[PDB]
Coordinates of C-alpha atoms and ligand atoms in Angstrom, one line a residue:
Chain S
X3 CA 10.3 -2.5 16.5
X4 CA 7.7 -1.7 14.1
X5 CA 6.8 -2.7 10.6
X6 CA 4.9 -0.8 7.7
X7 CA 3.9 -1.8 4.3
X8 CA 3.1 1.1 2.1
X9 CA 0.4 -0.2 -0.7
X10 CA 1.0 2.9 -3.4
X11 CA -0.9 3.5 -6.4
X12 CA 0.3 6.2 -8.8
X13 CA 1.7 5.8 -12.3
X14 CA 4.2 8.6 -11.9
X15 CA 7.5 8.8 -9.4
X16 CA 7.6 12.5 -9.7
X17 CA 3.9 13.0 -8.3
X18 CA 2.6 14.5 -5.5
X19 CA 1.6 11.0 -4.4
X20 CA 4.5 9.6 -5.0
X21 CA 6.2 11.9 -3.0
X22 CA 3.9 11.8 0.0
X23 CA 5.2 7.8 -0.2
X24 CA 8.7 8.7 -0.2
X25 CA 8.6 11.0 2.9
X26 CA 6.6 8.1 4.7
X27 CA 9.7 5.4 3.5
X28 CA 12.2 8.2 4.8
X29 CA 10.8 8.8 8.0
X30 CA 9.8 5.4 9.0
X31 CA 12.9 4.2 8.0
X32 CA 14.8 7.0 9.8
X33 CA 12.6 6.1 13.1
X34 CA 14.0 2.5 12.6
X35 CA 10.7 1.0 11.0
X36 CA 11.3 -1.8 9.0
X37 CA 9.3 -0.5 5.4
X38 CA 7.8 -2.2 2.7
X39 CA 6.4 -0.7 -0.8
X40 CA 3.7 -2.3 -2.7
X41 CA 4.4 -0.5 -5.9
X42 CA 1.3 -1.4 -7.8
X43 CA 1.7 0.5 -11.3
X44 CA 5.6 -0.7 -11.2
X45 CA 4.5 -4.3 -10.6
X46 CA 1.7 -4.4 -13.1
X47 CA -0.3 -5.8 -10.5
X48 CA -3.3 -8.0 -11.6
X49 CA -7.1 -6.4 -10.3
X50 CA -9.2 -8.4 -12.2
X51 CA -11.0 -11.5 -9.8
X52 CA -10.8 -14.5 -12.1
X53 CA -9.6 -18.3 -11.9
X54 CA -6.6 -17.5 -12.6
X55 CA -5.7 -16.2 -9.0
X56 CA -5.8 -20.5 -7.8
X57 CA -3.1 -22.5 -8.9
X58 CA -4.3 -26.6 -9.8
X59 CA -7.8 -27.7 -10.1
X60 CA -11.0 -25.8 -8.8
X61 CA -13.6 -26.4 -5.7
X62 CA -15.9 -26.6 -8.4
X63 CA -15.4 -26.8 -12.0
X64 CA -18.6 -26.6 -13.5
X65 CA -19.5 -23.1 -11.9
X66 CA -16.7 -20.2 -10.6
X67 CA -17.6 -18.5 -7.4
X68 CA -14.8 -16.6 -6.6
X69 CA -15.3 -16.0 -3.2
X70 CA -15.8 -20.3 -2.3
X71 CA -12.6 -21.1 -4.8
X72 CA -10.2 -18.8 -2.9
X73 CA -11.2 -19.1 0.2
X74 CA -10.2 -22.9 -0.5
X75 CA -7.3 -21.7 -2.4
X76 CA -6.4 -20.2 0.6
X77 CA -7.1 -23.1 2.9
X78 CA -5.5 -25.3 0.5
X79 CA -1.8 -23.1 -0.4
X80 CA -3.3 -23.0 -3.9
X81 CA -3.1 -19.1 -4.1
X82 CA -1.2 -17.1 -7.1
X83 CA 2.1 -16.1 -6.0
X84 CA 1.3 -12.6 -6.2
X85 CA -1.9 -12.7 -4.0
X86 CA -0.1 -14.7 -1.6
X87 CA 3.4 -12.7 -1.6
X88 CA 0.4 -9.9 -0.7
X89 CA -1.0 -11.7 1.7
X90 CA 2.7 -12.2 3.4
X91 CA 3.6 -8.6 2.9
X92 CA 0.2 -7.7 5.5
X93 CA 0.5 -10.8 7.6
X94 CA 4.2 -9.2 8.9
X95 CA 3.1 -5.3 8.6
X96 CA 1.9 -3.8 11.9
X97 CA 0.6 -1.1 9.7
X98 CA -0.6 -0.4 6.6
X99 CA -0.8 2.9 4.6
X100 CA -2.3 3.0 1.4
X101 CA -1.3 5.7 -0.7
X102 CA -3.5 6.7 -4.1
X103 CA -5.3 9.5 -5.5
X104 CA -8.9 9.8 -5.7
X105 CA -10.7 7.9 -8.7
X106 CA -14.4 8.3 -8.8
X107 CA -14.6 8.8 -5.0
X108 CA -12.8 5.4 -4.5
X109 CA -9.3 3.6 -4.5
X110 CA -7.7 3.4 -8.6
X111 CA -8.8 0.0 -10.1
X112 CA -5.4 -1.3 -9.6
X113 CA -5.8 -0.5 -5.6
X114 CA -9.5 -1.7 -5.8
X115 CA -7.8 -5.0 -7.5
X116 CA -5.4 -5.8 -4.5
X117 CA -8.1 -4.9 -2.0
X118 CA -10.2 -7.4 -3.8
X119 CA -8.0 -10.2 -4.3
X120 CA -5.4 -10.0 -1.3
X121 CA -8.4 -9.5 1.4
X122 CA -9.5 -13.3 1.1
X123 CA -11.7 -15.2 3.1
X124 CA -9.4 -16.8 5.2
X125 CA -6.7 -14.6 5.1
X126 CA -8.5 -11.3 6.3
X127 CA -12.1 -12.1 7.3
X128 CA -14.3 -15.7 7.7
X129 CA -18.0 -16.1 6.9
X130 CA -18.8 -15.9 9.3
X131 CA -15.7 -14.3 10.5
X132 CA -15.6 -10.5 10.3
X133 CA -15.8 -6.9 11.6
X134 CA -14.0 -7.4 15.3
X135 CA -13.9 -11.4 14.2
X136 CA -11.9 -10.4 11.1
X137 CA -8.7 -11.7 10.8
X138 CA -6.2 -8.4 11.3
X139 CA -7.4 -7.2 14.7
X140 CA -4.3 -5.9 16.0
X141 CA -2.9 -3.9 12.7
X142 CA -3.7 -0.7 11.7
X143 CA -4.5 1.3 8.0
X144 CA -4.0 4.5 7.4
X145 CA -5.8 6.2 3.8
X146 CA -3.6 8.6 2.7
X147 CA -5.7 10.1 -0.3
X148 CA -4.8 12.8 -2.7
X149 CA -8.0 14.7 -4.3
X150 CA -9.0 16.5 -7.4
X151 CA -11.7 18.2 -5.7
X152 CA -10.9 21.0 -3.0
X153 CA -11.6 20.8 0.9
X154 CA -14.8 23.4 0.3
X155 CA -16.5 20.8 -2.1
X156 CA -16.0 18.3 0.4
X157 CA -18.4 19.2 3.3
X158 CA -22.1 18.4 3.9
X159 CA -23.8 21.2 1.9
X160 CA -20.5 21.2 -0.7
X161 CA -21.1 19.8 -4.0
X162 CA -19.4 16.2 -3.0
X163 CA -20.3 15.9 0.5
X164 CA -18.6 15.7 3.5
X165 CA -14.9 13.4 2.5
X166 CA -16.4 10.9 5.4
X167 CA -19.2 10.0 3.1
X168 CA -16.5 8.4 0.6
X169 CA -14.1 6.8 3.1
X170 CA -17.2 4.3 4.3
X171 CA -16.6 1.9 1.5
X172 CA -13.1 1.5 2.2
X173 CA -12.3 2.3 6.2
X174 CA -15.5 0.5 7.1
X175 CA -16.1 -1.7 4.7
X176 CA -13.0 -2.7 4.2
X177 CA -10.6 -2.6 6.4
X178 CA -12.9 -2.3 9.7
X179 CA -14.5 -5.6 8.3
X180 CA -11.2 -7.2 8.2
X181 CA -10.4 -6.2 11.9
X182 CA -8.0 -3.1 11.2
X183 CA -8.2 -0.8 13.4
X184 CA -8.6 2.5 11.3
X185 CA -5.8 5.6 11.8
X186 CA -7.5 9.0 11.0
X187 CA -7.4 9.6 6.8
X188 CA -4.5 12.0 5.8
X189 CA -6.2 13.8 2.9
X190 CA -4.6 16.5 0.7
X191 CA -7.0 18.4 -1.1
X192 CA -6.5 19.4 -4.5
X193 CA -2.6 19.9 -4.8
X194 CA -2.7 20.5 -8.7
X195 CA -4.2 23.7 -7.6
X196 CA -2.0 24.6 -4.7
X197 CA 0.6 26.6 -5.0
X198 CA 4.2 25.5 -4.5
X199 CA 4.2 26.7 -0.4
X200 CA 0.9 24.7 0.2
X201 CA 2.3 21.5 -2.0
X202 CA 4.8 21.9 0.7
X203 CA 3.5 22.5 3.8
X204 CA 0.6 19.1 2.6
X205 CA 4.1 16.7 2.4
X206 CA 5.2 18.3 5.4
X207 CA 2.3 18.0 7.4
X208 CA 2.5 14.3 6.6
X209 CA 5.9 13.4 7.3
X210 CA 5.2 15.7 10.6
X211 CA 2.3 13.7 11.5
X212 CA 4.3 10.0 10.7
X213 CA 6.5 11.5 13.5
X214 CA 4.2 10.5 16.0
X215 CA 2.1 8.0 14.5
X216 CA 2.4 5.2 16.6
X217 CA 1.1 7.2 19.5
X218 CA -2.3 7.9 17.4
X219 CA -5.2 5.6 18.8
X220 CA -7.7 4.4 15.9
X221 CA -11.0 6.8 14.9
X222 CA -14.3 5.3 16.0
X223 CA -15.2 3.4 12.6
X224 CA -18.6 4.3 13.2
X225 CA -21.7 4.5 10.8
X226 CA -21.9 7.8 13.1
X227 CA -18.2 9.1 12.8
X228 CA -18.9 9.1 8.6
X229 CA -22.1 10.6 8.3
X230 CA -23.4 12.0 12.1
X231 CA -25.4 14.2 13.3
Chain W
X3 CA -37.2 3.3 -29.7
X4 CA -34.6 3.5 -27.0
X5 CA -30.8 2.1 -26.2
X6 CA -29.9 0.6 -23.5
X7 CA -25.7 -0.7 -22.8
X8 CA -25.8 -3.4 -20.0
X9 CA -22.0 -3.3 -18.6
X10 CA -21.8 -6.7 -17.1
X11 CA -19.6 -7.9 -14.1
X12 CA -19.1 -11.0 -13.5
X13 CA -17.0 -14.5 -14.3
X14 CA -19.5 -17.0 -14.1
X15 CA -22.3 -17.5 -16.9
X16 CA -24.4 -19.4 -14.9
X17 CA -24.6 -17.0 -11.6
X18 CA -27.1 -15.2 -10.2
X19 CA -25.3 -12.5 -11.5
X20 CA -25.8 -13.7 -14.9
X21 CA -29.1 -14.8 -14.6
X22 CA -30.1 -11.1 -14.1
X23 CA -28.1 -9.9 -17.1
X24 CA -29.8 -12.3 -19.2
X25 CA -33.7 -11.5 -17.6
X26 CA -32.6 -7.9 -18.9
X27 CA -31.7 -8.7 -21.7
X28 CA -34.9 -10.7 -23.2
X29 CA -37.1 -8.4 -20.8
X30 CA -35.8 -5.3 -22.9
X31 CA -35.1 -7.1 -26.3
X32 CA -39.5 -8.0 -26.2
X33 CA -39.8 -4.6 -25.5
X34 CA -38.4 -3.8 -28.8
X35 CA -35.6 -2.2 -27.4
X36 CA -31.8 -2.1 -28.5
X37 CA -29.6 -3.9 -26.5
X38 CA -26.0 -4.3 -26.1
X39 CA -23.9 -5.6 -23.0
X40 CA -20.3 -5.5 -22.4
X41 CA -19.5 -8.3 -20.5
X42 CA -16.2 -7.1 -18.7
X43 CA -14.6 -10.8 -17.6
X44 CA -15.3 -12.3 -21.4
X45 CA -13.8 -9.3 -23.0
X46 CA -10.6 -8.9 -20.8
X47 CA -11.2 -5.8 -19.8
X48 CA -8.3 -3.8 -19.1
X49 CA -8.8 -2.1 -15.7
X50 CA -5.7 -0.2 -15.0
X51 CA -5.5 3.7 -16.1
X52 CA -1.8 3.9 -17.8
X53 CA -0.1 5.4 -20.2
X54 CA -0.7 2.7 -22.3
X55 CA -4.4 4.8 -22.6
X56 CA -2.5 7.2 -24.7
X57 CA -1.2 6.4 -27.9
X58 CA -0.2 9.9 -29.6
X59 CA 3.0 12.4 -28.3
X60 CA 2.0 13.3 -24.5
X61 CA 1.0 17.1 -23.6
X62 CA 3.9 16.5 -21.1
X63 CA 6.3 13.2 -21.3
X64 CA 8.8 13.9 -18.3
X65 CA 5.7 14.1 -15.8
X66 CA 2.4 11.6 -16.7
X67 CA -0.5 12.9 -15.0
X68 CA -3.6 10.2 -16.1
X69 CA -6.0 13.0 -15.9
X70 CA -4.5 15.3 -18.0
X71 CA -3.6 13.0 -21.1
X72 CA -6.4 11.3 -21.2
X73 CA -8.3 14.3 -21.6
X74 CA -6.0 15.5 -24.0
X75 CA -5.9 12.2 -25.8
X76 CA -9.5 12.0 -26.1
X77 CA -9.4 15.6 -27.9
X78 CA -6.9 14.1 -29.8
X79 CA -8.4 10.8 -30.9
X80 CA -5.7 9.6 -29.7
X81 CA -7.1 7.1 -26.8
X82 CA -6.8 3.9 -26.8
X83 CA -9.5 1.6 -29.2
X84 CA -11.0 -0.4 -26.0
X85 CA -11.8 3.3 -24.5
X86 CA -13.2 4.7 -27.8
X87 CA -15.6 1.9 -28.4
X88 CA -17.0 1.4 -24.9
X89 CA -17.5 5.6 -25.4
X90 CA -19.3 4.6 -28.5
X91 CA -21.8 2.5 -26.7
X92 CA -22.3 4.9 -23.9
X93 CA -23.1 7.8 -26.5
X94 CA -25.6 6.2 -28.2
X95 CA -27.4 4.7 -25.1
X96 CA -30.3 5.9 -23.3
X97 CA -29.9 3.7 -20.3
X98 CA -26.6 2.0 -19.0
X99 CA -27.3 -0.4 -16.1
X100 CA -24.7 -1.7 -14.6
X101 CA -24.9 -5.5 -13.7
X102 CA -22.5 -6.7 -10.7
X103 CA -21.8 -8.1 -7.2
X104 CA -20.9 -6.3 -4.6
X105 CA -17.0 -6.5 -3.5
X106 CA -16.1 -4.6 -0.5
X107 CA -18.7 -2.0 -0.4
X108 CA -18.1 -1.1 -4.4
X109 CA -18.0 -2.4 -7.7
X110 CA -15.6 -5.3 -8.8
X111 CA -11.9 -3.8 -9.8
X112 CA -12.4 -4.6 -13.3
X113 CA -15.5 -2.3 -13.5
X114 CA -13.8 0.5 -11.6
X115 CA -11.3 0.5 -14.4
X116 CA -14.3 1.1 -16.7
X117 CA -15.5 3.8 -14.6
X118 CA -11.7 4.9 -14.1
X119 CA -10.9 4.8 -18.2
X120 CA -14.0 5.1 -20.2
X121 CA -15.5 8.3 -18.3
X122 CA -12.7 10.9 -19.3
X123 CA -13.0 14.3 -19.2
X124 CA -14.2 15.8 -22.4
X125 CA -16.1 12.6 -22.5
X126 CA -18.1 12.4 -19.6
X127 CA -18.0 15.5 -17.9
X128 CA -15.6 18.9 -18.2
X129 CA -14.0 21.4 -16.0
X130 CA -16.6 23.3 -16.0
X131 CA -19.2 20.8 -17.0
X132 CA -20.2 18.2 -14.0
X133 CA -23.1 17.1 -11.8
X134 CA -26.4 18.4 -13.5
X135 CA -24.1 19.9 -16.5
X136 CA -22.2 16.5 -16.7
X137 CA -22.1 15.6 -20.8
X138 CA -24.0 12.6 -19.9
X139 CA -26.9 14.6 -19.2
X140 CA -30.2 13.1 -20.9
X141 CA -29.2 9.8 -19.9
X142 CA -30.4 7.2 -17.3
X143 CA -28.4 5.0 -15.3
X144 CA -29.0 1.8 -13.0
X145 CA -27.1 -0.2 -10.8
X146 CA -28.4 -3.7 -10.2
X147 CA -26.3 -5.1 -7.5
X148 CA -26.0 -8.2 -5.6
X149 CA -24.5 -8.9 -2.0
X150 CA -23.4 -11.3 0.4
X151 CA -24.7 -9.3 3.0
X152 CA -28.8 -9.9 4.0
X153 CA -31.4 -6.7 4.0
X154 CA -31.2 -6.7 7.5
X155 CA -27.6 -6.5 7.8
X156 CA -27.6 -3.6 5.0
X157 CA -30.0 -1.3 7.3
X158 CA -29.4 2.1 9.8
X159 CA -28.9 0.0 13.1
X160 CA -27.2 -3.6 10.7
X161 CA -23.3 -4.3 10.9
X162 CA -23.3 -3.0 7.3
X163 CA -24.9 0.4 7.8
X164 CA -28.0 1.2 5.4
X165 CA -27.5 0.0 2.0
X166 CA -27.8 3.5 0.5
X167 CA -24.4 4.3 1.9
X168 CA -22.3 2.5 -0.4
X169 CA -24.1 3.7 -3.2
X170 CA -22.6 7.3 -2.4
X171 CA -19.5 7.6 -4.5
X172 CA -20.6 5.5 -7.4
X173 CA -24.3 7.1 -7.9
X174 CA -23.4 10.6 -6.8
X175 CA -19.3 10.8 -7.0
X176 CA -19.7 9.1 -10.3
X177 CA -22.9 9.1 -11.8
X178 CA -24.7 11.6 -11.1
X179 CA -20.9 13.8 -11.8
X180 CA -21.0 12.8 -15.4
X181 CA -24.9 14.5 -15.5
X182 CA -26.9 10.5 -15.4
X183 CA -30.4 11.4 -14.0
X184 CA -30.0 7.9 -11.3
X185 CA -32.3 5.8 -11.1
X186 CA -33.8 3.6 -8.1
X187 CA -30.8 0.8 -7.3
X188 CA -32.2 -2.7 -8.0
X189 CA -30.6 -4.8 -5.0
X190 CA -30.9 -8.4 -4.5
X191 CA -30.0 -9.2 -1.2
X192 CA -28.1 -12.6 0.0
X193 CA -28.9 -15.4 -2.7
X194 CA -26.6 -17.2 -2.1
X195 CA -28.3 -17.8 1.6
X196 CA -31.7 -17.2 0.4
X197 CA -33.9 -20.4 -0.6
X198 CA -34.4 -21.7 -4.4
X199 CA -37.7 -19.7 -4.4
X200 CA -36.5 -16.1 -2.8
X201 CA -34.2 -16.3 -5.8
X202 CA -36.6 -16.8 -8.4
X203 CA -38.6 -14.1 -6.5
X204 CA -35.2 -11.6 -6.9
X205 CA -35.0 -12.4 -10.1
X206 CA -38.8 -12.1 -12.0
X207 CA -38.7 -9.1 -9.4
X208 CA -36.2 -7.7 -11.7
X209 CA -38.1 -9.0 -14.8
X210 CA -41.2 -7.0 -13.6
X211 CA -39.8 -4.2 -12.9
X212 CA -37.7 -4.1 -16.2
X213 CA -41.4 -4.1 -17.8
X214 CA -42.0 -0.6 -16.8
X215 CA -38.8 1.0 -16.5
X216 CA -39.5 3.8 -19.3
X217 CA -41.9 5.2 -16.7
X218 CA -39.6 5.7 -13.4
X219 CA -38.7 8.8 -12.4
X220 CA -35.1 9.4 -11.3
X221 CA -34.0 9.8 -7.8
X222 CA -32.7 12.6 -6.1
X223 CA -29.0 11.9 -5.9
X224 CA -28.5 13.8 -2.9
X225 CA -26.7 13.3 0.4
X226 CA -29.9 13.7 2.0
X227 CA -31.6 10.5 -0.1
X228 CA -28.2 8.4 0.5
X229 CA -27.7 9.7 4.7
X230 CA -30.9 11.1 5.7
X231 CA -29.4 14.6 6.7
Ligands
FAD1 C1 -9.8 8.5 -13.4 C2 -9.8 9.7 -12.4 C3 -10.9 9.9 -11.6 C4 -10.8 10.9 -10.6 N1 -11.9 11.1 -9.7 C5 -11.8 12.0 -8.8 C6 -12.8 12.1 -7.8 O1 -13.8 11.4 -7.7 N2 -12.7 13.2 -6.9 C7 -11.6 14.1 -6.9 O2 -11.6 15.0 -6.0 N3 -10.6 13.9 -7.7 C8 -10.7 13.0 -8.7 N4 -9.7 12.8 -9.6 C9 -8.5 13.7 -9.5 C10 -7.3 13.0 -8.7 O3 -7.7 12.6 -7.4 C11 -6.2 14.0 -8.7 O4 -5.8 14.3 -10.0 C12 -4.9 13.5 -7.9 O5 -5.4 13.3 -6.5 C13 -3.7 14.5 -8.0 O6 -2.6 13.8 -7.2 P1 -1.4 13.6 -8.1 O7 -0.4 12.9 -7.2 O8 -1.6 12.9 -9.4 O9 -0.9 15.1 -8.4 P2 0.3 15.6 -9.3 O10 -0.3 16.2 -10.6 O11 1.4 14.5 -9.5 O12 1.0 16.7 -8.6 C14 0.3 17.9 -8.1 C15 1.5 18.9 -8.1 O13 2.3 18.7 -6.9 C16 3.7 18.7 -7.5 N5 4.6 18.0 -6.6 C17 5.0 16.7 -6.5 N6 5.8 16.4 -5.5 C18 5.9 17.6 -4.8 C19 6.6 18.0 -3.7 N7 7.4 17.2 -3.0 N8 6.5 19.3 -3.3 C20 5.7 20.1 -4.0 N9 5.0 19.9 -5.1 C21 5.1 18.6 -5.5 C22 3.6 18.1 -8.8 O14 4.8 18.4 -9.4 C23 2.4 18.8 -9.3 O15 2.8 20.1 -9.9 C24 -9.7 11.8 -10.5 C25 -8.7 11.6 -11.4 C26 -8.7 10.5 -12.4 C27 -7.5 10.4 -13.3
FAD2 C1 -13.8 -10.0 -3.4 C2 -15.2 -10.0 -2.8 C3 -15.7 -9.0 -2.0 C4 -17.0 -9.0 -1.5 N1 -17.4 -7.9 -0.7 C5 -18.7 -7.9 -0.3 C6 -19.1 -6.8 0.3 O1 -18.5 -5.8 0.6 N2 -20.5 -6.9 0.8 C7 -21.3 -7.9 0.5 O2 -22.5 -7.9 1.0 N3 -20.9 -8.9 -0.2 C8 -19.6 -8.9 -0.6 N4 -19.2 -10.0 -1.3 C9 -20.1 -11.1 -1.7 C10 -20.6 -11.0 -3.1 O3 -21.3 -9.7 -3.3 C11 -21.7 -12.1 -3.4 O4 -20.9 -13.3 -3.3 C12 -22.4 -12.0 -4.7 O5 -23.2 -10.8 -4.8 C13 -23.3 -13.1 -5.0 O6 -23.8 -13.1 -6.3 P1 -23.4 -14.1 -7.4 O7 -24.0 -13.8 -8.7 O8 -22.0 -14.4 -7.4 O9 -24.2 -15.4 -6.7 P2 -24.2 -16.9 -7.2 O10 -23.4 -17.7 -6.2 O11 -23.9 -17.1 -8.6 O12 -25.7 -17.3 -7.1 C14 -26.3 -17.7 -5.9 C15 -27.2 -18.9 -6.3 O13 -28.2 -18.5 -7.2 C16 -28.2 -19.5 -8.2 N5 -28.9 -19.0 -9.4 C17 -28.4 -18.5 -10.5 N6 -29.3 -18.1 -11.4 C18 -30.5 -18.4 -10.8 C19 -31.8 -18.2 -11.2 N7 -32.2 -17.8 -12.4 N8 -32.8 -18.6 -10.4 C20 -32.5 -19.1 -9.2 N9 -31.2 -19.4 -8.7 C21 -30.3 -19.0 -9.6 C22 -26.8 -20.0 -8.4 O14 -26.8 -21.3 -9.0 C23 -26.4 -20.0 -6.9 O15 -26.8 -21.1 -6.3 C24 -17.9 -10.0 -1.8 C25 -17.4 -11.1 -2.6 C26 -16.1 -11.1 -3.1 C27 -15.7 -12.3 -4.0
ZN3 ZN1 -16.1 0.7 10.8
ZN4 ZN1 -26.0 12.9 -6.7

């Protein structure tokens, strides 16, 4: 058995993102996956880092370091509820996909929020404690990324670059540091400007390829797989 | 005379993060300069983009596409009053550096919601109207970041990969987008590791350099200067 949390970011049910995350709930769940949502917008979830994320009395009162205070929070069970309900929600999943659209060639603040706070030391990485010492070896993430911008203005010579110049920040830096093993991005390029066929044929291509997804093996998360040559 | 707008990042007066928000400060203010800092934490900044942003009748309320309203809304006058009077600040400034640590690889959530709400199209760029025709053209910007990670670690052959590759989607997918001329990152490696003197070094580096900052020259925010290729 296998079990999948879906972190999803997108204000609106009826969009194209939110529909990529409910063909991924229906086909999990019809191959028997056990599913989890992580409806960010719907549970107004918290991004910003601030003392109110540890429950009871600080590390250090006089100055906040984030970082120190919730890795003790972590030690110590002193974690808000909804960092550690999080926390639980990963600790379970055997895989994680994180559904959003672009923002500024990055993850929407709310999703940059739950990286932020839920990724903990302790919880996902020590110091030291990280890349292949992180604390997730054994799950895998999946981006599934929605763009403004079309596939053309995504390569080397297009206006933005190649779209593996953008995923370093958050497949390496992220979720390579905390010992995921990294699935290949699904990214579906500009749907606002695809017709109604190719809308189509994105959503299918994604519930095709969550057919076979456990038989996928992780991308090399390589400073050389983003940007080599 | 010139403006500059220091958007701040950070919880703690008394951090290093702080300490180089304040050197700027009285570094610019003897200049003669006009200063004015956002500090994102003491304000409450509200990070997530929602409809919330909006407060006239929608273009379309059966289907809320962020994008599209906020654009609208800002045509309008119709955004929100946080988002209006950051705008304000970024308008009249010649320079906006952006003061913050480093979480996973990227800015701290609650100054991607900045990014995410304040930079809205008829603002900061248009369709067409981006990169070197951005509306922000004229204007410099500056990121002065600090990391957990060492120098050494933040280089070609390091765990981290070279610095310049994290700076990707926030100089150039961001940035650069909305028409800033970039210039040179300011980066100060490590102080929480680094000795009482390295730090004092970090920071009358910054001091020093703020001295003659009307005389850099932007760089050239292009994949070549972030990859090499
Ligand atoms: C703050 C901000 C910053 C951004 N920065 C960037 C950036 O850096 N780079 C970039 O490339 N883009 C950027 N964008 C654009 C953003 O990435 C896109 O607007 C987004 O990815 C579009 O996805 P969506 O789900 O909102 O589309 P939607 O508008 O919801 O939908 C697209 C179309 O698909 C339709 N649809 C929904 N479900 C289905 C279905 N099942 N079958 C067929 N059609 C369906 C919808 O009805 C709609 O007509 C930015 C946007 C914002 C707001
Ligand atoms: C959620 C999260 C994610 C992160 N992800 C990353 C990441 O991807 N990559 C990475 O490299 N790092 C990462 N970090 C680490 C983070 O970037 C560093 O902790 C941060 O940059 C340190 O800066 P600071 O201002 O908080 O340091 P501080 O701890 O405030 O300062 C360091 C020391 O300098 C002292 N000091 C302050 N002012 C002065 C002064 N004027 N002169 C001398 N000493 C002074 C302080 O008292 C303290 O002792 C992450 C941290 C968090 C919390
Ligand atoms: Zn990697
Ligand atoms: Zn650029």
């Amino acid at each position: 058995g296998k079990k999948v949390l879906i972190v999803y970011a997108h204000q609106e049910p009826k969009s194209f993102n939110g529909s990529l995350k409910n063909v991924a709930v229906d086909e999990l769940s019809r191959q028997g996956c056990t599913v989890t949502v992580s409806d960010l917008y719907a549970m107004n979830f918290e991004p910003r880092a601030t003392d109110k994320d540890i429950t009871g009395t600080l590390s250090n009162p006089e100055v906040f370091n984030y970082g120190v205070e919730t890795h003790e929070a972590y030690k110590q069970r002193s974690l808000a509820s909804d960092i550690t309900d999080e926390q639980k929600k990963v600790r379970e999943a055997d895989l994680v996909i994180f559904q959003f659209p672009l923002y500024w060639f990055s993850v929407p603040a709310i999703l940059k929020g739950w990286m932020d706070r839920v990724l903990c030391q302790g919880f996902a990485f020590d110091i030291p404690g990280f890349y292949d010492s992180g604390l997730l070896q054994g799950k895998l993430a999946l981006l599934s990324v929605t763009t403004g911008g079309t596939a053309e203005m995504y390569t080397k010579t297009g206006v933005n670059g190649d779209s593996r110049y953008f995923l370093w920040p958050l497949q390496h830096g992220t979720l390579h540091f905390c010992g995921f093993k990294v699935l290949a991005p699904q990214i579906s390029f500009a749907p606002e400007i695809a017709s109604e066929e190719e809308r189509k044929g994105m959503v299918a291509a994604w519930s095709q390829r969550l057919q076979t997804i456990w038989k996928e093996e992780p991308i090399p998360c390589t400073a050389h797989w983003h940007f080599g040559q």
